[PDB]
């Protein structure tokens, strides 16, 4: 994989836009605002372990990674040609949209004055997690969990056991090299299990940040004036191997809590991506 | 829209100033300090949903975007001339004025010692939201709400339903591309519904930040020594299409809470804008 | 030790990768998720002093330093040659993996609603400590403890007494030059005792940060796009004396607390290291 | 006002030093530590509104701006000379002195253990406000209050009514261009009313920051190694019109609270200024 000069001429540079909607737990359908669709953009009620050895989170309570594989313009006539062209992601403008909606404090969440059930509807608060990646192949994931004893559903989610065909081991609570996967499905890989693998991702740039806590104030900036350069130390950005551009993200704002038993629901927001790509000559 | 050289000569550069007052809910009139006017700069008492399916916020409890369209000096004799001139916004000095007024802790808000009704009058705290934009056309808005079931008044505010003529759908809690609008009216577009659209705003620069929480300390800096460059990666700033310069903003400092049922009122502060514009030759 | 030119030619530059798993107290074995292995990645329950003069922490309740000594490619034929080559660490990409696992709030920890035993499983919070070092010899440690009267176990951990053969002195609560050691064993040197020695470490670069508190929200960033330059003011990086590269770290995220007597367990996460090394001519 | 070259030669550059003591409410005299003087550097007890329409803060409970007008060396023989010289403020080293005094937690304030009246004397906490300005004329102020109904004393303080001769209007809770003043007296303009006017102050540089909250920890840095450049985008600093250099500031650290009814007293600290000035030729 020799990377040569930038290709010049008509259409050697292109822009790709996309928004990835969050995957907090409640699927996009049913759309009915009375049959579950009113939780889209949120997780369903987080259910807790019933004992130290009985922790089975429902799939719709586990935020998962969002991902999209975008198709770029075709490039090579001759595939047996000594020198071909590849799309190179140069930079990305990305933005999490909707933080202002968090200013709705007039709903029916747990109120701030619980003695009289007054005040305001408590806004979303808590743990936040923002990660996005742009690469030329799926984001490589390293699994690591809080508890290797957690009983994740066998269906509907991709967990470490889905990959290894075996039960998690104690090493899965730290770095177990065996527990790897690729983010190749949207809404299926729980973010409390799968993390960007720093030992791989040679062709993907990822950026994440985590803020913990139970009532931590969410903080978010948004501007259309910032660009993230995806070029590495050698001036080379992610190269689209099959002309497939991979976008990955997760944007958890925290939880809203209901007036019944403090049931928490994760809140996620959509992320916008505008990727600038250029053609690169490759040998 | 070919952008050419900067125009030189007498009056090729100009400065425009404006302050946009906040739109927190209580309109500017009545002015009477006994008939409602005493709430100008604040929202009226935030009223809460009465059930999970009955959330009808009053219009005067919903901060909305502030916007102004400023007229710039006329430019072109010949409109059928191959090369015309356009005003280009180069930079802006902007400032949110009045945070010092938040130091009044001698009023009648909920006191800090509630056992004896003593201490100080609790100052403004909570969720903060600061956004401003400068562009050559209205700020493009993407709607996204906390709850697609919220029953916003049909009159007095522009909501997603005003635009689509239909009820919100579950997709409106995430990114629904159909829910778009333009900030073309001051005090009408609620900020908990309408967000800068990152997929558009090619000719507008916007910058916002959100801090959540219920008692989060407001933080604010102000100096007349800072400038925000509005030029893009190509050195081109927003171009005033009809010589109309659009200013948009929202500056929520948090809430003050009364001594009756913890009623919260949003507090907003005015924003000052000093935009430097230059004439640009356009083909 | 005269440092000359960089060696050029085939294989003069090399990359080395490694992940160091945390050493919070529970060893890697037994692996059994019922015999202790379920605490791997965590410390065992923190036990408190029984009086002002009886403080005997269990070894498995004390996070210790992680360290690894990596073997690099051999270099010198002639050891009696006027000019030899040495491996020089130029830079390191390092990352603490797994913060997303902290988003599991569905387990059996102390719940956020203790009155009804509801809400969510409190996530990991508290004191955080992140330190990593890359050097050409073991990290030099300076001992300093909260209490020189603490009765650390004599076996299983390397403490100041292990080194001095005598009991700690009051000076061990501040800087006592006599209390020095080298981080030459993984999982043995408690981080509450051993700190990077600023008076030594001429051939090691270390970087640490501490955040205290009992419920402080853990914060962590991770990206594969950042590099830490290890070169000193003279453009020289750590030199691998016996071609042994030393990696050291500790990454405490805070504690989880159980539903029984608020027993706290430290949580640590693995750290990834990708070190770029180049050959240097030395006289 | 044409600004020409910098004047060169003997004494063309000069330094001016000054410290402005805080104006929190209690005047410098009486000096008696039993007759009120013990509150100098603090405000007197903050008294609260007795109803929604009765808010009469005492003057000594309202921090006001500190300001000093310094006389610089005389400059011009000939005032009818085509080209004169003016003093130009180039930069300032400024510092808020005394934060370490906030480490006195052995006094008689509300204690941290209120059940037994033990622990420590609660240190100053809360809302902080730091602003300083250096200009060639008085700082231009824009009035904006929390409540236009507040009954400020007519004597002893300069309020919006002092300036307009009329009662405040609802517009005074937002930006009302009529409510302007100049900071031309020390200890008279309340900071909860008067803010730097961004629409004016062409010849003054101001910098401020606000942190709200009721128990927010005060934060402060101090070093003698930092300089603030006062030069504008054209390399011109404030010009001293009548060779009078204006220094303005306010530095509120928060409040201390007593053991009786949680009475709060604002704490302010003095600010030091070292201004470097140079002579400028003006046409």
């Amino acid at each position: 994989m020799e990377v040569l000069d930038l290709v010049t001429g008509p259409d050697s540079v292109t822009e790709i836009e996309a928004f990835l909607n969050p995957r907090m737990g409640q699927p996009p359908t049913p759309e009915s605002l009375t049959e579950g669709g009113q939780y889209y953009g949120w997780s369903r009620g987080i259910n807790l372990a019933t004992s130290d050895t009985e922790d089975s989170p429902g799939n719709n309570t586990l935020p998962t990674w969002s991902m999209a594989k975008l198709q770029l313009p075709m490039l090579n006539e001759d595939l047996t040609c000594d020198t071909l062209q590849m799309w190179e992601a140069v930079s990305v403008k990305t933005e999490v949209v909707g933080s202002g909606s968090l200013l709705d404090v007039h709903g029916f969440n747990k109120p701030t004055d619980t003695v009289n059930t007054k005040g305001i509807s408590t806004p979303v608060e808590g743990s936040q997690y923002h990660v996005f990646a742009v690469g030329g192949e799926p984001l490589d994931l390293q699994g690591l969990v809080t508890d290797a004893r957690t009983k994740y559903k066998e269906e509907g989610v991709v967990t470490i056991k889905t990959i290894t065909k075996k039960d998690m081991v104690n090493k899965d609570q730290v770095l177990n090299p065996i527990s790897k996967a690729k983010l190749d499905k949207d809404g299926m890989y729980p973010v409390e299990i799968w993390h960007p693998d720093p030992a791989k991702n040679e062709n993907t740039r990822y950026f994440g940040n985590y803020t913990g806590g139970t009532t931590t104030p969410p903080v978010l900036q948004f501007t259309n004036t910032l660009t993230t350069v995806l070029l590495d130390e050698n001036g080379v950005g992610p190269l689209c191997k099959g002309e497939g551009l991979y976008l990955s993200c997760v944007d958890i704002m925290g939880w809203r809590v209901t007036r019944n038993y403090d049931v928490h629901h994760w809140r996620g927001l959509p992320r916008y991506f505008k990727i600038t790509l250029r053609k690169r000559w490759v040998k | 829209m070919e952008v050419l050289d900067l125009v030189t000569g007498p009056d090729s550069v100009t400065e425009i100033e404006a302050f946009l007052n906040p739109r927190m809910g209580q309109p500017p009139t009545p002015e009477s300090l006994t008939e409602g006017g005493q709430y100008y700069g604040w929202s009226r008492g935030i009223n809460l949903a009465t059930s999970d399916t009955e959330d009808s916020p009053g219009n005067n409890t919903l901060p909305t975007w502030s916007m102004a369209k400023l007229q710039l000096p006329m430019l072109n004799e010949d409109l059928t001339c191959d090369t015309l001139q356009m005003w280009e916004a180069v930079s802006v000095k902007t400032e949110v004025v009045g945070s010092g007024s938040l130091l009044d802790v001698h009023g009648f808000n909920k006191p800090t010692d509630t056992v004896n009704t003593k201490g100080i009058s609790t100052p403004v705290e909570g969720s903060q939201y600061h956004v401003f934009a400068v562009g050559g056309e209205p700020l493009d808005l993407q709607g996204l709400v906390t709850d697609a079931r919220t029953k916003y008044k049909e009159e007095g505010v522009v909501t997603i339903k005003t635009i689509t003529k239909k009820d919100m759908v579950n997709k409106d809690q995430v990114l629904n591309p159909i829910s778009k609008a333009k900030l073309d009216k001051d005090g009408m577009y609620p900020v908990e519904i309408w967000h800068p659209d990152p997929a558009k705003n090619e000719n507008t620069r916007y910058f916002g930040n959100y801090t959540g929480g219920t008692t989060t300390p407001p933080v604010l800096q102000f100096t007349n020594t800072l400038t925000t460059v509005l030029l893009d990666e190509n050195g081109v700033g927003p171009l005033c299409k009809g010589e109309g310069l659009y200013l948009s903003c929202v500056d929520i400092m948090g809430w003050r809470v009364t001594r009756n049922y913890d009623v919260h009122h949003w507090r907003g502060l005015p924003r000052y804008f000093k935009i430097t514009l230059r004439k640009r030759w356009v083909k | 030790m005269e440092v000359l030119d960089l060696v050029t030619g085939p294989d003069s530059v090399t990359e080395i990768e490694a992940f160091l798993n945390p050493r919070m107290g529970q060893p890697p074995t037994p692996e059994s998720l019922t015999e202790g292995g379920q605490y791997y990645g965590w410390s065992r329950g923190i036990n408190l002093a029984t009086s002002d003069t009886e403080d005997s922490p269990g070894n498995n309740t004390l996070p210790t330093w992680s360290m690894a000594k990596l073997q690099l490619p051999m270099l010198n034929e002639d050891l009696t040659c006027d000019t030899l080559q040495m491996w020089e660490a130029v830079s390191v990409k390092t990352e603490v993996v797994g913060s997303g696992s902290l988003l599991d709030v569905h387990g059996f920890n102390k719940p956020t609603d203790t009155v009804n035993t509801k809400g969510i499983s409190t996530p990991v919070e508290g004191s955080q400590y992140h330190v990593f070092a890359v050097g050409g010899e073991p990290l030099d440690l300076q001992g300093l403890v909260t209490d020189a009267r603490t009765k650390y176990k004599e076996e299983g951990v390397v403490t100041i007494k292990t080194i001095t053969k005598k009991d700690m002195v009051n000076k061990d609560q501040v800087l006592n030059p006599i209390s020095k050691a080298k981080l030459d064993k993984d999982g043995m040197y408690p981080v509450e005792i051993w700190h990077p020695d600023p008076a030594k470490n001429e051939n090691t670069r270390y970087f640490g940060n501490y955040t205290g508190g009992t419920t402080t929200p853990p914060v962590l960033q991770f990206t594969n796009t950042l590099t830490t330059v290890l070169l000193d003011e003279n453009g020289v990086g750590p030199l691998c004396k016996g071609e042994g590269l030393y990696l050291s770290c500790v990454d405490i995220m805070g504690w989880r607390v159980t539903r029984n007597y608020d027993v706290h367990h430290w949580r640590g996460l693995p750290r990834y290291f990708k070190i770029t090394l180049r050959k240097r001519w030395v006289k | 006002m044409e600004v020409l070259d910098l004047v060169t030669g003997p004494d063309s550059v000069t330094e001016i030093e000054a410290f402005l003591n805080p104006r929190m409410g209690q005047p410098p005299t009486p000096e008696s530590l039993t007759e009120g003087g013990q509150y100098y550097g603090w405000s007197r007890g903050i008294n609260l509104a007795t109803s929604d329409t009765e808010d009469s803060p005492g003057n000594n409970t309202l921090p006001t701006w500190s300001m000093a007008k310094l006389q610089l060396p005389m400059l011009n023989e000939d005032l009818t000379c085509d080209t004169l010289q003016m003093w130009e403020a180039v930069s300032v080293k400024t510092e808020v002195v005394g934060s370490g005094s906030l480490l006195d937690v052995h006094g008689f304030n509300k204690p941290t253990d209120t059940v037994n009246t033990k622990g420590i004397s609660t240190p100053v906490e809360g809302s902080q406000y730091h602003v300083f300005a250096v200009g060639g004329e008085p700082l231009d102020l824009q009035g904006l209050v929390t409540d236009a109904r507040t009954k400020y004393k007519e004597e002893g303080v300069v309020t919006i009514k002092t300036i307009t001769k009329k009662d405040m209007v609802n517009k005074d809770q937002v930006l009302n261009p009529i409510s302007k003043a100049k900071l031309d007296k020390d200890g008279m303009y309340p900071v909860e009313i008067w803010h730097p006017d961004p629409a004016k102050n062409e010849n003054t540089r101001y910098f401020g920051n606000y942190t709200g909250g009721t128990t927010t920890p005060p934060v402060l840095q101090f070093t003698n190694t930092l300089t603030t450049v006062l030069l504008d985008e054209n390399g011109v600093g404030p010009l001293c019109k009548g060779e009078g250099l204006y220094l303005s500031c306010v530095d509120i650290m928060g409040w201390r609270v007593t053991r009786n009814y949680d009475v709060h007293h604002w704490r302010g600290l003095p600010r030091y200024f070292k201004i470097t000035l140079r002579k400028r030729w003006v046409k």
């Binding site: 994440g208 900036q221 948004f222 910032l226 | 900067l6 460059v229 | 914060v219 | 504008d232």
Partner: peptide
């Protein structure tokens, strides 16, 4: 305080100090 953000959270914008304006400007005319 203790709740940071510096990656995936749409990042911080800056401003230019007035006196630095020409330079910064001269690069985009």
């Amino acid at each position: 305080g203790g709740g940071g953000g510096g990656g995936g959270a749409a990042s911080h914008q800056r401003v230019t100090p007035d006196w630095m304006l020409p330079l910064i400007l001269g690069l985009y005319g």
